[PDB]
């Protein structure tokens, strides 16, 4: 019997509250796929290929050829179109400048490397490593891998350089240590938590781009939906191909042995009968493409709006950029796909306290400003919630609001005046 | 049938006759009096796009032959994608006008014959970063963007018996 | 700009032309016209025509509402996009980045359109921005002071703090910074005296 | 076939005896006995919502 989880009872009590007291510094690996390969079939040189009688014949189907051809050209269409959505987020091709003194990151492992041919990081090699004439034609993306590379790099560079500026408007460059002093206040850490522990932040980040490295490098069992969007569409090619050697009740799947070896007055019922089969078959693919670029439309615009508010800003959406509290996002390409590291917050080492919903002074209820009131057991003090910073209970970070006797579960204690 | 016959390495054993594919269509034969193998590919198919300005404009095309070497069909490219006939390759970079493929866009500019060049992603811009220097802004402009959403497509409905057989 | 909605009209009205076409196609009968075979044969010759074009009507029928479902169900995402661009954007304030509009984002106004609805995003933007030399706290005696809300900036001589989103320089005092910690840890820390203004006051 | 025969003003040519349609339905003849062109209307038909 399938198991759900680990069994884990929480000590909850109407005056105890656990608070972390360190953090973990977490990159998630996250795959999406944004397009796939753009085919196109030749309908009369699939059902009736070289043969004038099969294409006279087909002919009385009216337009059972030319709206086919539509479709796939819609879909190739599309395809381009979500390359361009996904990745053409930014106006101005930035790069990095020639110095990497990012207050002690180190994004080696996903900045171009420009030793290699095609100016992709070493995750997206990583990541390229590891994916891998009847009438279907093969249309090559209007964006190649390198564009796709240095629009990569782009967003890359501007991120790291200026934060989510340069997704607003003209892009301001702005020292890395305070980018994530920033993104830290927005998850309600205080900025002085980053600085003072910005050494083990930045040893905590590489740590886990290393993580990163060696998991893709290893996994083969990885880059899973990219694999299978590519599968399935070599296996659907693969099953309308092989359904050219069915004789769907014809003597001979193969036109030339009809043709020579019957009159056109016979031979025309065999014909008949396979540009039947045939167009069943196409049809089928028709529609299983349509349904299989409409799942793919839809993940390239989760993949676009995870970009755009992940990657160009911050986003405070619960797990939609990564679980835990979300930092920033480093978008990388893939083949057929993107790849976003999400840098996560996790707080991580907690320790209980005594908590209590307000403090009463001089009759007088007080309220913490930005924090949560907690007590080692005698003395009190007003710490962020994410972080134990305890600090002296005064009338700043308190603020009063009548008197102390509808404030249920208030404690006393004495408030200093600075 | 009809192919390109090649000389070809198969190993074919000598009861063979002839190879086959995935589409068990003949791909190898055996010569029936020179006891060698036979190679046959398909000639040469492939789509012809006509690249062309609106019609308004001018009434000069160049055409795309999809996945073609500049040798089985005044002005020629190979693109990756194809054979680029009439359209003039200019080693700038602009913006997508007409998209062909690989990189390659055409456009019709200047005495004015259609060009094709690889796309440019945008402007070059090296920001000026530094452990201790900040851009700040000191004046804002407020902007109106249209965004267009359709909502309903048109409620239509058929007659199933009159359309198949009306009356 | 409106090719977004004219392509939805000319699309469903390519099917329909489409549609109507079909019945212009024989089907390997003798006449894609009903009428004529009836009056020409009798039934037990007729069954075989009226069935040939029975059968190609009806799958063209098929094909024609296959795609109407797939374009249907593509409108119908766009139409939950756009219902919650109106439920975010305009009945409210989105952080949503590029969710509505670039930039940064105040109100939207809803207008409506031919199957289709367009909204005007009104979004501030950064205009002309000026290089500071900034610094991420600042020791007064020995205390690194951090900014509340906004950041430390300088002219080169003197050292102001600054909302991050517009340049409103104002003098460094204990309200506008919090203390934390000694003046060792912080990386990057710069000297500068924090004015207090109980001071002048207490003297006087 | 069956339709509304009204008078029409269509302007055939003296060679000309059938008006198709886009559906190679004849939408427009050509009366033999008295030369004027009538058109050819469905007619009438819907759905019946209750
Ligand atoms: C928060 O966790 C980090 C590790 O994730 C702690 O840093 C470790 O500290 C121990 C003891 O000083 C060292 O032996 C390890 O090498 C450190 N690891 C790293 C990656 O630097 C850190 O001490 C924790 N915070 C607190 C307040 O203890
Ligand atoms: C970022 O990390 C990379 C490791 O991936 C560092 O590159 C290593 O540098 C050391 C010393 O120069 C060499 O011994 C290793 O062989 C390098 N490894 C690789 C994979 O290149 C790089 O120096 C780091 N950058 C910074 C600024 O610390
Ligand atoms: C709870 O915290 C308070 C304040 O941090 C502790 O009180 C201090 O304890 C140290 C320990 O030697 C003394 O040097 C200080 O003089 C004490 N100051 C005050 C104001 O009491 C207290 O010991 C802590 N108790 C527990 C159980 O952790
Ligand atoms: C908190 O302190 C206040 C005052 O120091 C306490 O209020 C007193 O409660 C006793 C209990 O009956 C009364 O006899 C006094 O008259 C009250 N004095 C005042 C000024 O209110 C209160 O009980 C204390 N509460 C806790 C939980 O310690
Ligand atoms: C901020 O930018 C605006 C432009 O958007 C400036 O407004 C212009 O001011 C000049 C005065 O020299 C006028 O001639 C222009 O007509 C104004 N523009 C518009 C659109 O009205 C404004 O002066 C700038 N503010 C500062 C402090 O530089
Ligand atoms: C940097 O800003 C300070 C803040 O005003 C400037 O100092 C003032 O400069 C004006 C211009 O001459 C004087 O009238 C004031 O008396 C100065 N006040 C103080 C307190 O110094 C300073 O000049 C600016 N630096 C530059 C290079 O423009
Ligand atoms: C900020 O000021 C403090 C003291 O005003 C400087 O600290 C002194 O630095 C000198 C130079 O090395 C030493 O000789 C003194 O012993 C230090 N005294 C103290 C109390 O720290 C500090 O160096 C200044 N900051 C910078 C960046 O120069
Ligand atoms: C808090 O107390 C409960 C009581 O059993 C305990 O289970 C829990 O582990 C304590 N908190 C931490 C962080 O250990
Ligand atoms: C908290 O819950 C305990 C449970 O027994 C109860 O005894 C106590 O009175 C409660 N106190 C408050 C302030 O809710
Ligand atoms: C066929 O006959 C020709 C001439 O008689 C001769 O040159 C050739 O080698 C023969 N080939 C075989 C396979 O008998
Ligand atoms: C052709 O384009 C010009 C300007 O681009 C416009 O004024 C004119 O109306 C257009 N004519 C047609 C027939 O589209
Ligand atoms: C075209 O043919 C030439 C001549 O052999 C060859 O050098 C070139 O690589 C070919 N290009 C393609 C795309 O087949
Ligand atoms: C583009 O530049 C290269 C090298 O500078 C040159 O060989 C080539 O002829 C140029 N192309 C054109 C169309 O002049
Ligand atoms: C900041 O100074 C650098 C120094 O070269 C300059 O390039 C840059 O343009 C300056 N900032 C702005 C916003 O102009
Ligand atoms: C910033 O980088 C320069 C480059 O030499 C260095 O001299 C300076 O000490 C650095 N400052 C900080 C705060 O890292
Ligand atoms: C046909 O004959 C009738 C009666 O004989 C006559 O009224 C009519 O005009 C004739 N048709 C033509 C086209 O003359």
């Not at chain 2, 997508?96 to 060009?115: E, F, K, L, R």
């Not at chain 3, 989103?165 to 919090?178: C, G, L």
Request: a negative charge.
């Amino acid at each position: 019997t399938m198991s759900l989880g680990v069994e884990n009872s929480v000590a909850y009590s109407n005056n105890s509250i656990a608070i972390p007291t360190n953090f973990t510094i977490s990159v998630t690996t996250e795959i999406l796929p944004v397009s796939m390969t753009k085919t196109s079939v030749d309908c009369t040189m699939y059902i009736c290929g070289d043969s004038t009688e099969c294409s006279n014949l087909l002919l009385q189907y009216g337009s059972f050829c030319t709206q086919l051809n539509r479709a796939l050209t819609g879909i190739a269409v599309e395809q381009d179109k979500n390359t361009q959505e996904v990745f053409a987020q930014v106006k101005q091709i930035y790069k990095t400048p020639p110095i990497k003194d990012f207050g002690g990151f180190n994004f080696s492992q996903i900045l171009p490397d420009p030793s290699k041919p095609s100016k992709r990081s070493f995750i997206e090699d990583l990541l390229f490593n590891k994916v891998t004439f009847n009438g279907l034609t093969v249309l090559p993306p209007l964006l190649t891998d390198e564009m796709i590379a240095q629009y990569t790099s782009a967003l890359l560079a501007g991120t790291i350089t200026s934060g989510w500026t340069f997704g607003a408007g003209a892009a301001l460059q702005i020292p890395f240590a305070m980018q994530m002093a920033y993104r830290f206040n927005g998850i309600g850490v205080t900025q002085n938590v980053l600085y003072e522990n910005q050494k083990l932040i930045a040893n905590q980040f590489n740590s886990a781009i290393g993580k990163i490295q060696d998991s893709l490098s290893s996994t083969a069992s990885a880059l899973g939906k990219l694999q299978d969007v590519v599968n399935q569409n070599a296996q659907a090619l693969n099953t309308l191909v092989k359904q050219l050697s069915s004789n769907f009740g014809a003597i001979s799947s193969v036109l030339n042995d009809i043709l020579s070896r019957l009159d056109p007055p016979e031979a025309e019922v065999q014909i008949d009968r396979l540009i039947t089969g045939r167009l069943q078959s196409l049809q089928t693919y028709v529609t299983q493409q349509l349904i299989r670029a409409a799942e793919i439309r839809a993940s390239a615009n989760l993949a676009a709006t995870k970009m755009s508010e992940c990657v160009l800003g911050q986003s405070k959406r619960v797990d939609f950029c990564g679980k835990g509290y979300h930092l920033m996002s480093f978008p990388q390409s893939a083949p057929h796909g993107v790849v976003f590291l999400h840098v996560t917050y996790v707080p991580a080492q907690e320790k209980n306290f005594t908590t209590a919903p307000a403090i009463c002074h001089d009759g007088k209820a007080h309220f913490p400003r930005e924090g949560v009131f907690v007590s080692n057991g005698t003395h009190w003090f007003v710490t962020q919630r994410n972080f134990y910073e305890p600090q002296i209970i005064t009338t700043d970070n308190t603020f009063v609001s009548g008197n102390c006797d509808v404030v249920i579960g208030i404690v006393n204690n004495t408030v200093y005046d600075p | 049938g009809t192919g390109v016959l090649t000389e070809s390495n198969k190993k074919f054993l000598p009861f063979q006759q002839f190879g086959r594919d995935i589409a068990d269509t003949t791909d190898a034969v055996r010569d029936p009096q020179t006891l060698e193998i036979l190679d046959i590919t398909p000639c040469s198919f492939g789509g012809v796009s006509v690249i062309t300005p609106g019609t308004n404009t001018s009434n000069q095309v160049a055409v795309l032959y999809q996945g073609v070497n500049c040798t089985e069909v005044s002005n020629v490219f190979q693109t990756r994608a194809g054979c680029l006939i009439g359209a003039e390759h200019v080693n700038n970079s602009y913006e997508c006008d007409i998209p062909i493929g690989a990189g390659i866009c055409a456009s019709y500019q200047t005495s004015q014959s259609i060009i094709a060049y690889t796309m440019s992603l945008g402007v070059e811009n090296s920001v000026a970063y530094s452990n201790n220097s900040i851009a700040i802004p000191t004046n804002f402009t407020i902007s109106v963007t249209t965004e267009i959403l359709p909502v309903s497509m048109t409620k239509t409905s058929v007659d199933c018996t009159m359309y198949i057989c009306g009356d | 700009a409106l090719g977004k909605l004219q392509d939805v009209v000319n699309q469903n009205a390519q099917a329909l032309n489409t549609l109507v076409k079909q019945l212009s196609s024989n089907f390997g009968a003798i006449s894609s016209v009903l009428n004529d075979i009836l009056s020409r044969l009798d039934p037990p010759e007729a069954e075989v025509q009226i069935d040939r074009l029975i059968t190609g009507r009806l799958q063209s029928l098929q094909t024609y509402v296959t795609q109407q479902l797939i374009r249907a169900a593509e409108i119908r995402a766009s139409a939950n996009l756009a219902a919650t661009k109106m439920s975010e954007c305009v009945l409210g304030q989105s952080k949503r980045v590029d969710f509505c509009g670039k930039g940064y984002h105040l109100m939207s106004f809803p207008q409506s359109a031919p199957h289709g609805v367009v909204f005007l995003h009104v979004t501030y933007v950064p205009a002309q921005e000026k290089n500071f030399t900034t610094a991420p706290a600042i020791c007064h005696d020995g205390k690194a002071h951090f900014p509340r809300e906004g950041v430390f900036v300088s002219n080169g001589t003197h050292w102001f703090v600054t909302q991050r989103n517009f340049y409103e320089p104002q003098i460094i005092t204990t309200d506008n910074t919090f203390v934390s910690g000694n003046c060792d840890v912080v990386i990057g820390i710069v000297n500068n005296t924090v004015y207090d203004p109980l001071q002048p006051e207490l003297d006087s």
